[PDB]
A paper describes a structure:
The purified protein crystallized readily, and the obtained crystals diffracted to ~2.5 Å. The obtained [name] crystal structure includes one [name] molecule per asymmetric unit. The overall structure of the [name] monomer is similar to that of P7 [name], with an overall RMSD of 2.2 Å for CA atoms. In particular, the N-terminal HTH domain resembles that of P1 and P7 [name], confirming that [name] belongs to the type Ia family. No ligand density was observed in the active site, confirming that this structure corresponds to the apo state of the protein. It is worth noting that the nucleotide-binding site is generally poorly resolved, and in particular we were not able to build the P-loop in this structure. One of the symmetry-related pairs is consistent with a biological dimer, and largely resembles the P7 [name] dimer structure. This suggests that we have obtained the structure of the [name] dimer through crystallographic symmetry. Comparing the [name] dimer to that of the P7 [name] structure confirms that they possess a similar architecture, with helix 1 forming a domain-swapped interaction with the adjacent subunit. Overall, this structure confirms the common architecture of [name] proteins, and is consistent with the fact that the [name] chromosome 2 is plasmid-like, as suggested previously, since the [name] structure confirms that it belongs to the type Ia family.
Author numbering:
A (entry chain A), B (entry chain A): 4 to 119, 124 to 182, 188 to 368, 376 to 406
Write the structure that this text describes.
Amino acid sequence: KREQTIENLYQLAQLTQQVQADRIEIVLEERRDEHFPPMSKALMETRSGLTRRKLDEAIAKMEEAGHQFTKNNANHYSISLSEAHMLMDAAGVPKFHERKKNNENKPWIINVQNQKKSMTAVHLAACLALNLDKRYRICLIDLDPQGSLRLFLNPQISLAEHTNIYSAVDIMLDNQVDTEFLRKNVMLPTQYPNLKTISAFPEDAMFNAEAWQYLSQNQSLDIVRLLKEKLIDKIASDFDIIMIDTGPHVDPLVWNAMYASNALLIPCAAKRLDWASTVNFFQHLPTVYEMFPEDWKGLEFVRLMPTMFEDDNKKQVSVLTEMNYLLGDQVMMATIPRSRAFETCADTYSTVFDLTKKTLATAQDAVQKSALELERVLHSHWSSLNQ
Amino acid sequence: KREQTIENLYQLAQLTQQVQADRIEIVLEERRDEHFPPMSKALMETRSGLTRRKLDEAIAKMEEAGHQFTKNNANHYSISLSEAHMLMDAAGVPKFHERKKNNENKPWIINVQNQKKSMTAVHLAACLALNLDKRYRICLIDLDPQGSLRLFLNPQISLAEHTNIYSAVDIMLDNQVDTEFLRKNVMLPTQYPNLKTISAFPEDAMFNAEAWQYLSQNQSLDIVRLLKEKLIDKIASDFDIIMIDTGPHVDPLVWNAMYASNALLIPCAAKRLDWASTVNFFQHLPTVYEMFPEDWKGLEFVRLMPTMFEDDNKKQVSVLTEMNYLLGDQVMMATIPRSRAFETCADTYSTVFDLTKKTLATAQDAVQKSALELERVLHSHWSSLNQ
């Protein structure tokens, strides 16, 4: 019955290909729109690299203008994220971008690749976005259609007053598209004044279909140029960093992400399972690239991190120091632990920077030093990349 | 630096493509090898469709041979799964297969397709495997490389005394292979005398790579014939049912599973998210099939189930009765609830049939009536399929 079943299939293809899917409605039906825990002026000091005197002066200037700061039950300052950014601009420090010896840069395009909880790229975006001396313009793009990565960091929906919401692949396969268009309709603001977001929707699955059947008509290899030529290039003006999050699969989606991407970052854990998948990955991961039209700009760096670490199991060391001595540098000294706190983030769709003893500090100190450590490398290669 | 980075890539491709991966070791490092809760003789009565008299007679015959049954702290029978199968054969009922008006059958090849917790195919396998009057020979094949589906139902490892362990794609791309080979080395026994298992390993990821680059050399479409011609056909002798579990992605893996597969089953939930992905799926799901060499045997049936149901939220009804009235029959009346119990299965990698008030019964009655209800349909179409 080969024929008859196809016929029922299109019958359901076109019967159902008219039912439903109000997207603004469900993003709106998810707004967990809560915001950030205000800083202490000790914490604002740490995150800013401002002296209490330069900071207090910045306050006083903002207060001698209209501004009124909220205050404690102990009448202690409670500075918001917005307040902290403006405090910077009041202290007369200019954004990372601003310091002009780096203002002709090209933007980092880090392609994170979760090999199995796909929530480390979001901690990076928040820690890098949560460094107020620099105040990077970042962008965290979700590319896994099975991604909750806009449940974390829910965009300011900013209302039903939003036409439509597009994902990356909605701008690859589309719907005239310009950076004015992408700002107004596909990149959304998120609770971190300087971290914007680009969500994905399980519909984004279509892509692969059209890819794997858009090669029948071609052993071509112009299908990996779509996200660069259609979207990333059209938003590299406004951004210092870009992170494209893909999780585990082979794909023309993650393919479409590697070609536009000029560095790789591979979160993994002590586990031999994710470890083992990953070396299969690498073994499969040269042709992987060889394939896109030679105009591919190579990679700058590529590195991996240890995620979810037990530094009490003699057993997990017995894979991470295989990693250490297997790979030395090109791994990260920052072993993020397991942490009750990290995992109620996965429960509650927050990041450790959203909540108010016994993980908090080492949860965030873990991420913050892994983001500091991440941070060195990017500066190391920004020169070469910039070429 | 296009060239230089590829060169480092193969450098890591071949540097690392010699490190590690002792598979028997890790399956062995996982044996959660515990077994089933023994039945009551009330429960053995329910699962068997034996009268207490025919059952007690079967016991007495087994006891008048050597056998010794374990007993209760209240000296009440505690029949194991093995004991129950032999009790059947002692009661002189023949296996489903056995009843010869269905012994020239062809085996069901249900392709389950999890659209987002990928643990319903395992409840089906256990409920269908846990019907002792029939005693189906089933096979639950994992095809998602991100599958825990051998952590559930850990095979009798039966020891390090096992050469190697192969997955489906290890027998697609291989390593001379015959049904004697597949029995001795790739299908493993599991705690249900009549449910065997075929695991997958995240290495299985390779497949896609070779597929999507094994079409550059061909707009061919012989790559979907691999799992049928290489594995399934070579084990259809020994099986009454076959379930191939794939979860969400487009793929030549799930492709390779649809072509060898002669019915479809699509678990989904009240949620508009998984609901929405699925209708995109259907809209993409005719060409999907149109593509394999015409010799494709069509589908027999195709249906969906409701999984994880809140019958207290007026809100979830407000999608499942859209489903009901949208789709009527070709859905299942058996709405599996949310259930604390179902979700500690996902916690503990069991199925509801593994544990000992307030879900148990409705958890299993839910699965059992969805498996009963599943059960009717398969009989309905077995005739036509058999053609």
